[PDB]
Amino acid sequence: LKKEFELSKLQQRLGREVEEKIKQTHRKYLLQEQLKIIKKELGLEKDDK
Amino acid sequence: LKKEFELSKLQQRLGREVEEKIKQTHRKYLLQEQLKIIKKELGLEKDDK
Amino acid sequence: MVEVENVVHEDFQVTEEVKALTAEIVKTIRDIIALNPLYRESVLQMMQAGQRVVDNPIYLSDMGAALTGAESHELQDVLEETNIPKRLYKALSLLKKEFELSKLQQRLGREVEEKIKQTHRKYLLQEQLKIIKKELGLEKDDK
Amino acid sequence: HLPLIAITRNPVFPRFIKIIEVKNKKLVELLRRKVRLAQPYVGVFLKRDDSNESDVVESLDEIYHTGTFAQIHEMQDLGDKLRMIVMGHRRVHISRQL
């Protein structure tokens, strides 16, 4: 049972790691996107013909 | 009901007046808040163009 | 070092309608902790204005003004004020000043996310259009 | 008759429990000098704009005249060697901090 258990707990750590990496990806993408919208709507209100 | 309405009215009006005097704070302060937000989620040295 | 408790705290004898601004301060604090949750909201339920347990109102106003994120200097400025309505006015001002930024950030987040949804949802529609014109009609628009 | 405390970026709002964890070990000397008193206490003051620790030990004007004395509860020192607890209990406006 423990022989199965070691792999399971390892898989659990691996799964949370891969998923949290996806979250750290997209959460930071939301932050950068917010950064852009403030640079576009409020900051750089120029850049046009 | 009249006394409560006069109290609620004077409180809402005095608070609306304080709120109007706070809206006098310029929108630049808001743009600075978003600016600090841009820097809080950006970081790094100026290794830009 | 010499020190003295020169804690001035004048208040009107008639204390019935004087706590109504406090009511607005706690309403703004309830709106700040509901729309911008910082700390748990159970503490606001522990220390209410209706319990008559506020033996030290100055302390209650300071604890309510402490949730504001205004810079320390502003706190010193609130202490410089001697009159009681001036500090109440400043505490409310600090709260609203934070409140506008909070509301901007929240509106922006929901707006930007909905833009992402309108992005991908229109892509789902385009995918359905393709798929429904994938195994239905086979256009011969080639050489 | 104690040296001024090194707040070191730690706001202590009045009547709001707070924790202070300075990295410096010179305040620990002060923590050892107040264990002999029967009623120990500590004061909390505020720093002015553009914080700078070297002027606090050189000059005494950076800190504001206002102070908030209160009593210490208990030390823990989980990570650092200076884990003091602060509170806004007794407000005061010193005439001259000098």
Side-chain angles (χ1 to χ4, degrees), chain B residues 12-49:
Chain B
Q12 187 180 7
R13 285 190 302 92
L14 169 59
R16 173 56 167 79
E17 204 187 359
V18 178
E19 287 151 14
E20 170 169 359
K21 291 181 178 198
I22 299 149
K23 182 189 282 189
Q24 290 291 89
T25 305
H26 284 282
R27 289 78 200 159
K28 61 96 191 171
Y29 161 56
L30 292 157
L31 300 177
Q32 272 198 342
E33 286 173 306
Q34 308 327 69
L35 178 153
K36 296 180 284 292
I37 287 169
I38 287 162
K39 279 72 177 175
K40 269 202 285 305
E41 313 139 358
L42 171 69
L44 295 174
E45 299 88 46
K46 294 292 292 184
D47 67 348
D48 64 348
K49 61 63 189 181

Side-chain angles (χ1 to χ4, degrees), chain C residues 1-5 7 39 58-59 62-63 66-68 72-73 75-76 79 87, chain D residues 1-2 4 11 13-16 45-46 49 64 66 69 89-94:
Chain C
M1 59 176 65
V2 65
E3 78 299 354
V4 62
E5 298 300 345
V7 184
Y39 303 90
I58 188 164
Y59 296 165
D62 296 332
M63 189 278 292
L67 300 177
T68 61
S72 304
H73 184 52
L75 304 172
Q76 183 59 12
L79 287 171
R87 52 179 54 187
Chain D
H1 192 122
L2 286 182
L4 307 178
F13 307 91
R15 303 290 182 175
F16 198 77
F45 310 86
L46 194 50
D49 313 352
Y64 283 114
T66 57
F69 300 158
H89 183 62
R90 289 187 305 188
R91 62 178 55 184
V92 84
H93 181 197
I94 313 297

